[PDB]
């Protein structure tokens, strides 16, 4: 009768242990789920787990330590794998109440953290993350600055604040600097994670990164007990800052070479466990921070950085390596065999799907730089605004373009929540408007309203730009100065804008000269369109000598053969034809005219 006696006596513990087994079996099955039958089986196993936990929770009077363990596991499984967020809240709520009549301080906060972070995340609604901010402030007020839990709830707050980044940018950033100051005494690993999150948030909002934050960022990979996965992230984030500023990344590529060699074989956990105080850990699931995944994404980063030098058979890195990262990422997706939940297995697969879609985006971008159409159509990406951008560019450089459609595309993008996309949209709209004003035929009242549209456009472009990180990007700085000049002088525009006084005039002219002198002979990225527009402006505005003018107009005329820009190559050609005539270079006049003659043929058909 011992069996019957054990059954009834150890029923509670036995069911608690069965539950863990169903969950193990679901974790085993997850990465192999490839069919509807398997999907049903998978969630039949986790259902079996939940009945099990519920059986323990609902049907027995538990000790407080038993109630904590089973309730947090139940809530965690329900929030992650089901739509039962109300049920999860109810169970967490019950524990919150029991925990108030006890001295179990850390447990109480652990439950609060699930209500303030994990639950509003599971609700998939930004508005739910914003009401959180009120409950966290209440908790924070009661706690001292030296308290580990003050740090965590303050991070709950920054997350709640991250929803609605309209002038919220100021608050989130003040909040990170405060948290960074609080945590710089504490655990070095928690400080590293907060730091990385802040530089990531700054990159996401494209606002300037204070020097001191980048110094602190680089100090993370110093010869330190920082978890290796956070040191890597720190290095990746440093690379991204140089790439957003269109800077040279040679040195950072060596730092990667050191890091990958100094720390080889590190085996490699996908989770970082930080001890924030006696009895409580923070766990960071970071399945991209490992040798193979970083070699793969580093290649993509390297590709984007050299993307614009795809015309040259020396730095056309992007052409050789984008098909590689595309292949590697589809392999990593197929061979994924992680023992975790199905939602976590699909989450890792979705990152590889995003890598591949960015790969295809940059491949198309490169193709449109070198030709009129992309062989095979423009691919549909999961990035819908990047689709509109690709639609716009290819439509703009068509043989017979529809500029009213190009305009509508670029306007949609001026309303984008992506601040970088906004800027790109406004910059292009501006060039369209400037071309309207330059070719106007309507008389004094028409010319005047178009003038006013152009100055509105120009101001919208300048405000967007001055409030971004791209102020420290010289490709953008040089091109904002160029776009300024093309609307304001008479060979470039037919109706140039004139202003009082201006001090704007000496600003951008200093700039244009600074860039033109240093890049004729810190020097700019070597994008053909950017040096074409620099040399053509400089050669026209700043050069006195006629033979040097010929050097520059010949250089600009040849540039238009190295990538697709027939319209630019044409206007460089008539410039060169006149320079070659005044210089009385009679052979060169002959061949320029000859080239020009076949040029207009192709353009007109």
């Amino acid at each position: 009768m011992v069996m019957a006696v054990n059954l009834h006596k150890h029923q509670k513990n036995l069911v608690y242990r069965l539950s863990q087994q169903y969950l193990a079996a679901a974790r085993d099955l997850a990465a192999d789920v490839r069919s509807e039958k398997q999907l049903q089986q998978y969630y039949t196993l986790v259902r079996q787990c939940v009945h099990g936990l519920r059986y323990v929770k609902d049907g027995f009077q538990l000790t407080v330590e038993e109630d904590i363990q089973v309730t947090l596991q139940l809530a965690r499984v329900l929030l992650e794998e089901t739509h039962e967020v109300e049920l999860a809240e109810q169970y967490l709520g019950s524990l919150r109440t029991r925990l108030r009549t006890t001295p179990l301080t850390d447990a109480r906060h652990a439950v609060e953290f699930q209500l303030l972070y994990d639950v509003p995340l599971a609700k998939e609604d930004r508005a739910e993350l914003r009401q959180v901010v009120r409950h966290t402030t209440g908790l924070l007020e009661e706690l001292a600055d030296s308290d580990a839990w003050a740090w965590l709830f303050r991070y709950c707050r920054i997350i709640g604040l991250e929803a609605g980044g309209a002038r919220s940018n100021s608050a989130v950033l003040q909040e990170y600097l405060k948290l960074l100051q609080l945590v710089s005494a504490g655990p070095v690993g928690l400080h590293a994670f907060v730091l990385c999150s802040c530089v990531a948030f700054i990159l996401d909002r494209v606002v300037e990164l204070d020097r001191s934050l980048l110094t602190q960022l680089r100090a993370l990979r110093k010869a330190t007990a920082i978890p290796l996965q956070l040191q890597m992230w720190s290095l990746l984030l440093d690379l991204l800052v140089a790439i957003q500023l269109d800077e040279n990344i040679m040195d950072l590529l060596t730092d990667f070479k050191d890091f990958f060699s100094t720390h080889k074989d590190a085996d490699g956990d996908d989770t970082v466990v930080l001890s924030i105080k006696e009895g409580v850990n923070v766990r960071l699931f970071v399945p991209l921070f490992n040798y193979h995944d970083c070699k793969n994404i580093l290649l993509l980063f390297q590709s984007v950085s050299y993307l614009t030098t795809c015309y040259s058979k020396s730095s056309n890195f992007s052409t050789k390596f984008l098909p590689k990262v595309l292949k590697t990422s589809q392999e990593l997706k197929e061979t994924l065999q992680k023992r975790t939940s199905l939602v976590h297995v699909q989450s890792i697969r979705n990152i590889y799907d995003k890598v591949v879609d960015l790969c295809r985006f940059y491949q198309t971008w490169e193709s449109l730089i070198l030709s009129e159409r992309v062989e095979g159509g423009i691919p549909r990406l999961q990035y819908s605004e990047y689709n509109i951008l690709l639609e716009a560019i290819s439509s703009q450089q068509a043989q017979q373009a529809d500029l009213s459609h190009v305009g509508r595309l670029y306007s949609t993008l001026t309303k984008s929540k992506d601040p970088e996309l906004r800027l790109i949209g406004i910059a292009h709209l501006y060039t369209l408007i400037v071309a309207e004003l330059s070719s106007c035929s309507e008389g004094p009242e028409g010319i005047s309203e178009l003038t006013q549209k152009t100055t509105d456009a120009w101001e919208q472009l300048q405000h967007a730009y001055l409030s971004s990180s791209l102020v420290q990007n010289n490709v953008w700085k040089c091109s904002v100065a160029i776009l300024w000049a093309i609307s304001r002088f008479e060979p470039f525009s037919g109706h140039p804008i004139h202003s009082s006084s201006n001090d704007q005039q000496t600003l951008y002219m200093q700039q244009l000269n600074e860039f033109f002198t240093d890049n004729a002979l810190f020097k700019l990225k070597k994008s053909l369109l950017l040096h074409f527009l620099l040399n053509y402006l400089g050669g026209t505005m700043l050069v006195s000598d006629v033979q040097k003018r010929c050097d520059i107009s010949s250089s600009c005329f040849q540039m238009g053969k190295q990538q697709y820009m027939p319209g630019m190559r044409y206007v460089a050609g008539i410039w060169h034809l006149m320079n070659s005539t005044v210089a009385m270079k009679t052979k060169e006049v002959a061949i320029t005219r000859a080239k020009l003659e076949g040029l207009v043929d192709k353009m007109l058909n």
Binding site: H83, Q244, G279, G567, Y570
Partner: protein, 126 residues
């Protein structure tokens, strides 16, 4: 003259720019975003297992035990993963033949039916 004079072809650089995409200004933002998302962050209590082991002999209990003596008829809704390439084939093994999962765990599966595909959804309207 000069070649192309009296054609439609743009002759000023501002007019020609309206047909030239600013292809040196390359979007890079979505790059940082695919890294900045630590898949999961979570707080966990470090503490001893509060649930005692059962006698090892009781693991040999041969009969089904009813977990859920009532509740799944409020049936649970499960999360169908967005972006899942799902196929339809019954070529795979039955649920009580799946690893692993001990023998009492297999017995407690006997009689229960599978989760309906209708209960496995990407989303709700509430």
């Amino acid at each position: 003259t000069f070649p192309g004079e009296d054609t439609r072809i743009p002759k000023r650089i501002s007019e020609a720019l309206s047909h030239q995409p600013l292809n040196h200004l390359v979007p890079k933002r979505e790059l940082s975003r695919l890294l900045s998302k630590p898949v999961q962050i979570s707080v966990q209590l470090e503490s001893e297992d509060a649930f005692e082991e059962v006698p090892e002999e009781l693991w040999q209990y041969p009969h089904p035990i009813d977990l859920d003596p009532l509740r799944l008829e409020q049936p649970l809704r499960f999360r169908r993963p967005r972006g899942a390439r799902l196929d339809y084939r019954e070529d795979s093994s039955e649920i009580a033949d799946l690893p692993g999962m001990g023998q009492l765990a297999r017995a407690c599966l006997s009689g229960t039916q599978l989760v309906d595909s209708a209960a496995i959804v990407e989303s709700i309207e509430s």
